[PDB]
Amino acid sequence: FFFDTLKNLAGKVIGALT
């Protein structure tokens, strides 16, 4: 739950960066 969301948030950041 929380772990999945945290990982997902990081993925969005990486994608947004490049």
Side-chain angles (χ1 to χ4, degrees):
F1 296 108
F2 191 101
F3 179 74
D4 287 345
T5 48
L6 186 64
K7 185 180 282 190
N8 285 343
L9 281 163
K12 185 178 181 65
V13 173
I14 293 169
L17 177 56
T18 297

